[PDB]
């Protein structure tokens, strides 16, 4: 595409530079170019792809929430709605771009549990971001697409990864947020966070000091949500 004339290794190097410079739009464009070279991604490369798009869409979501709040207060000229719609359309375009990379062809080529779970978690997340802005029409279908991606990732992670694996933990955290914030299922969110936390606690004894630090950091996020929800 736009990055078709740049070497894969140069795109990866530039994505790392863009991260250091906090240029996340550039980072995402470099990683899109790398994915479109057609080769599978290593663990580090998958993280670069996810970090780039999470930061781009995170800024869009924060702006959408500011504008949606102003619009709701205005509804209690067309400019606030028009501008919220502009940001919303841009956000949807970024989510569709990520989902398109996962569908062409990252997921189908991902055979190891670590890569397949990582990509299915991403698919759940980007459908979840689409669901946050969706209103009634395909809102149900978007929610089901998120749920289905998260569920397949959960099924694989429970069979193939230990309960302390950081991707398994982050998948459970984000699926619990999906249940609480999107699916109107706070009891399912609380149950998932509690079971995930407890099963990780029981497996910490198997870990090195560095892996212990990685796993306990995500467990604290599960605990923080449980404290907010209970």
């Amino acid at each position: 595409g736009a990055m078709g004339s740049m070497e894969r290794a140069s795109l990866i190097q530039k994505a790392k530079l863009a991260e250091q410079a906090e240029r996340y739009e550039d980072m995402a464009a470099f990683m899109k170019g790398a994915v479109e070279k057609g080769e599978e991604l290593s663990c580090e490369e998958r993280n670069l792809l996810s970090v780039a798009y999470k930061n781009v869409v995170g800024g869009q979501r924060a702006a959408w929430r500011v504008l949606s709040s102003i619009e709701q207060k205005s509804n209690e000229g067309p400019e606030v709605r028009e501008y919220r719609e502009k940001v919303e359309t841009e956000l949807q375009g970024v989510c569709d771009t990520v989902l398109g990379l996962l569908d062409s062809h990252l997921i189908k080529e991902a055979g190891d549990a670590e890569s397949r779970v990582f990509y299915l978690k991403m698919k759940g997340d980007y459908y979840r971001y689409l669901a946050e802005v969706a209103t009634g029409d395909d809102k149900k279908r978007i929610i089901d697409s998120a749920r289905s991606a998260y569920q397949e990732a959960m099924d694989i992670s429970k069979k193939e990864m230990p309960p302390t694996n950081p991707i398994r933990l982050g998948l459970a955290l984000n699926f619990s947020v999906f249940h609480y914030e999107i699916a109107n299922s706070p009891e399912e969110a609380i149950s998932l966070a509690k079971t995930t936390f407890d099963e990780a606690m029981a497996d910490l004894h198997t870990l090195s000091e560095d892996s212990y630090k990685d796993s306990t950091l995500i467990m604290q996020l599960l605990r923080d949500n449980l404290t907010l929800w209970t």
Partner: peptide
Amino acid sequence: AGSIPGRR
């Protein structure tokens, strides 16, 4: 509710 954060 907090999801996995973006990197540092």
